[PDB]
Amino acid sequence: KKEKWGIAHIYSSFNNTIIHITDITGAETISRWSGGMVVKADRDEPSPYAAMLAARRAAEEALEKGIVGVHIRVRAPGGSKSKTPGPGAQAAIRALARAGLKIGRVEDVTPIPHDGTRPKGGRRGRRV
RNA sequence: GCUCGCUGGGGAUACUGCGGGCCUUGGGACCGGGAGAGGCCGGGGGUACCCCCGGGGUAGGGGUGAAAUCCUAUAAUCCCGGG
């Protein structure tokens, strides 16, 4: 068939967003970009704007490297942490769409525990 | 009348006590088909989390209302193959 398809792993949280493009197997990295080096203040890294910028940069790198199609994999921290993706997940996906990348299957691979470890914060939780 | 009562006799047998007899309603015993995170012992699993090694890859990661401490160039966050 001769089409180079990859996988875009999106790590979305309430503090930062990471976009990482890799080959079909996932063992070879193509482009890794996040909001930390795109924005300046720590409060704007998880912003959808920073998500769009980082996803766009990763898309340009992948296109120059010779990637046309990609399968999305959204991921929240999961485990004992939050189970909900951050604001910069759909923004990153649509930025990848805008940059000129074909999008195949879209899935959430957040690690869900089957009554695993104890979450942080104590029994009373955070009281701010 | 009071000394809250004691004592010698006679009568009663509904009730209570005592002795005997006859029952099953309360409660126990037993059989039948089922229900349940009731308890103990043994054997096989679920992802998740943490660590270690081998590859990919650069400069960030984390965290907050905002920051900082902290981890990171001895190759971090993140992805993959394994223990």
Pairing of strands A17-22, A29-34: antiparallel
Pairing of strands A69-75, A29-34: unpaired
Strand B reaches within 7 A of the A57 CB: no
- CA-closest candidate to residue A49, choices A96, A93, A91: A91
CA–C1' nearest nucleotide, residue A25: B80
Task: Name the helix (H) or strand (E) containing A9.
Answer: strand A5-12
- CA-closest candidate to residue A33, choices A12, A67, A56: A56
SS3 content of chain A, % helix, strand, coil (to 5): 20, 25, 50
Cα separation of A102 and A71, whole Å? Answer: 8
Half-sphere exposure (Cβ direction) of A19: Cα atoms closer than 13 Å: 35
Nucleotides of B under 7 A from a protein CB: 46-50, 54-57, 59-68, 76-81
| Burial bucket for residue A96 (CB in 10 Å: 0-12, 13-18, 19+) | buried
Method used to determine the 3D structure: cryo-EM
The data reach a resolution, in angstroms, of 2.7
- CB < 8 Å & 24+ apart, contacts of A121-126: none
Strand B reaches within 7 A of the A27 CB: yes
CA A91 to the chain's CA centroid: 10
